[PDB]
Design a protein around this ligand. Structure first.
Ligand SMILES: Nc1ncnc2c1ncn2[C@@H]1O[C@H](COP(=O)(O)OP(=O)(O)NP(=O)(O)O)[C@@H](O)[C@H]1O
Ligand SMILES: CCN(C)c1cc(-c2ccccc2O)nc2nccn12
Ligand SMILES: [Mg+2]
Length: 301
């Protein structure tokens, strides 16, 4: 394989992992419904269901997300075409992609199976996620958002703990980002939407930063930090943003989440500012055995 990954500025461990995923991916060509065998259900959300599946031709285990869409064949074909851009989204902070296709009313998005599931699943078992672990998660989310914005000119649009995947090798990766404008066009109890997105405002990277800040507070505290639908949304729009409880969390982490949760998107921190924030600089220097913590917390390996 003639790897052209020089632009990523990968460390040796990251380079080995990314080249290994891409090498496995070479066993996978056209994806068809008949070539899969369902192993189990990984989980489900509002828009789709995700199954752990065996791809019979390659022998690979994958996560197959199925989104029910039975629309004009030409517009569903445009969605499938737009999803093919995922073949160009190679980053240590973005879930690996095998392919996307349509079959009998469902769009399938086939991904790298992440054996640690999502941080939403981890949170249910851990209770609360330690601040040092959240430092590593924050680095991964900022780096993933920067990669999608700088290399592909897209915003995530759906940052939340269920869209941050982890594995037994200690990798942290984003999924469910808005790669397809038409899929966004064609498509509850908790909202991670920014106050400006709830009110109307055009999508900005700033809205993803709010979502990340809220997700960090939830994971730090062990509960959604904001109940009726109007009551919850009215709180986000018209009341002060949530804050981390003082004393239990470092001043750096409190300031970092505070900068993400500023109501005015112009005053709210941007990705460049967050990357050099004291919380990120401190967290990047820390030696944290994320893999060991994850495997111990959820009983992996
Ligand atoms: N690649 C993957 N590997 C392992 N688990 C996955 C993978 N992708 C998704 N999951 C799990 O699938 C479950 C359901 O995900 P999903 O259907 O996207 O719901 P959601 O994240 O709550 N909503 P949304 O992303 O907005 O559609 C979650 O519990 C994830 O942990
Ligand atoms: C709002 C979440 N949805 C369902 C969504 C998911 C994905 C997608 C899913 C998994 C991995 C990588 C992805 O990109 N891609 C989208 N493009 C537009 C919407 N998309
Ligand atoms: Mg999801």
């Amino acid at each position: 394989l003639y790897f052209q990954l020089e632009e990523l500025e990968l460390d040796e461990q990251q380079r080995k992992r990314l080249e290994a995923f891409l090498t496995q991916k070479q066993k996978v060509g056209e994806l068809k419904d008949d070539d899969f065998e369902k192993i189990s259900e990984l989980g489900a959300g509002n828009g789709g269901v995700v199954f752990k599946v065996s791809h019979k031709p390659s022998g690979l285990v994958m996560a197959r997300k199925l989104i029910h869409l039975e629309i004009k064949p030409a517009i569903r074909n445009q969605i499938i075409r737009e999803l093919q851009v995922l073949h160009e989204c190679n980053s240590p902070y973005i879930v690996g992609f095998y392919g996307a296709f349509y079959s009998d009313g469902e769009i399938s998005i086939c991904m790298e199976h992440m054996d640690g599931g999502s941080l939403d699943q981890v949170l249910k078992k851990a209770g609360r996620i330690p601040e040092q672990i959240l430092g590593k998660v924050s680095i991964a989310v900022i780096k993933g958002l920067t990669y999608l914005r700088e290399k592909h000119k897209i915003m995530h649009r759906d940052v939340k703990p269920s869209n941050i995947l982890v594995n037994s090798r200690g990798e942290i990766k984003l999924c469910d980002f808005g790669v397809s404008g038409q899929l966004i066009d064609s498509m509850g109890t908790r909202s991670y939407m920014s106050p400006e997105r709830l009110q109307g405002t055009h999508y900005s990277v700033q809205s993803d930063i709010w979502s990340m800040g809220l997700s960090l507070v939830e994971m730090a505290v062990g509960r959604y930090p904001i109940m009726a639908i109007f009551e919850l949304l009215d709180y986000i729009v018209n009341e002060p943003p949530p804050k981390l409880p003082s004393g239990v969390f470092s001043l750096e982490f409190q300031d970092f989440v505070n900068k993400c949760l500023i109501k005015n998107p112009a005053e709210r921190a941007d990705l460049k500012q967050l990357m050099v924030h004291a919380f990120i600089k401190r967290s990047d220097a820390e030696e944290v055995d994320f893999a060991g913590w994850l495997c111990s917390t959820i009983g992996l390996n």
